[PDB]
Amino acid sequence: RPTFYRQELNKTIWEVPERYQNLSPVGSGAYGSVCAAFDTKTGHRVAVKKLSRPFQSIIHAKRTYRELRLLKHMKHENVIGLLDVFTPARSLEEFNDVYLVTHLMGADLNNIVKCQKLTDDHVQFLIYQILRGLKYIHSADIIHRDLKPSNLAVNEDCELKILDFGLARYVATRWYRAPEIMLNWMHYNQTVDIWSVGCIMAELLTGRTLFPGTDHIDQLKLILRLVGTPGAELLKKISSESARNYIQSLAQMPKMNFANVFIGANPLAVDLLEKMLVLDSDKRITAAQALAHAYFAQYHDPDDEPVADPYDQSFESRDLLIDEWKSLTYDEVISFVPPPLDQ
């Protein structure tokens, strides 16, 4: 066990290993309770997140377990990874705080698009990286579901990682959400995330939110204005009578020609957008397919777009007591094997 030191920061007690020095809060709460720190083992800046009331309820406890499991799994260049996880507790009995350590990222994409509209080259490279991380996540049967520009972090070298910062103690998730999981939430696949990548890529190209809806209905209306109302073939895959009635209640709208909307953009980018922003989720391009798209010719390397190890999601179906989820989380803290150092 390493030696821990104690301090207080912005309404909260941090007890961390001496390994981590010069803690300073970041984001004014925006990211959670998170400090930048210097990691003396590596000589690098890191981020240290203290989970908020991780075992307050069964729901918090399972969420805690879930986040730890997911972070321990992710081993890929374009996905946040886990550098360390610790608790000052010496036993399960005393276990009540969970701290996570990741790389410290430079800025989010929300900050970057709000600052400047990007070059077509920067768009190629950023979207390629998103898709490469998504091929990986999706290969483990993990769906992000919350993709938006504030959940993507980029450094000065333009290397990107996918994360999920979660709630706030503003960019609406709804603006980037697939129509199929806008009303019903039964019939959806991993390509909900590809819909979000299309919305993000549009905004990077244009500097404007593609579908800035006020609510779920308005959101749907903005969407169908671009992609058109569902034709007979998609209508007959909608089980929800109320959704089908709602859709069919609208004055029918044609699909726009995306070249008339994204006027002046690279045509290969326009063609990719058409393949991502398809209403029918069975017809939407997958991440693996998208990487082989001609828009990514300068980056795509089929020998360097790896899949994930399998991920055991079987816990998701379980209904357990708080002390059980806590003990499982403790197990995962104990079994953690830190990553290779040499960067």
Ligand SMILES: CC(C)CCNC(=O)[C@H](CCC1CCCCC1)NC(=O)c1ccc(CNC(=O)c2cnn(-c3ccccc3)c2N)cc1
């Ligand atoms: C509650 C619910 C909505 C989701 C909760 N979420 C999770 O479970 C995921 C778990 C892994 C996911 C990774 C992406 C793919 C899906 C799983 N969890 C994380 O992604 C996750 C967990 C911990 C951390 C800690 N790091 C930071 O906070 C951090 C790092 N850099 N910067 C930075 C960024 C830009 C500018 C300046 C500084 C930060 N602020 C970061 C992300």
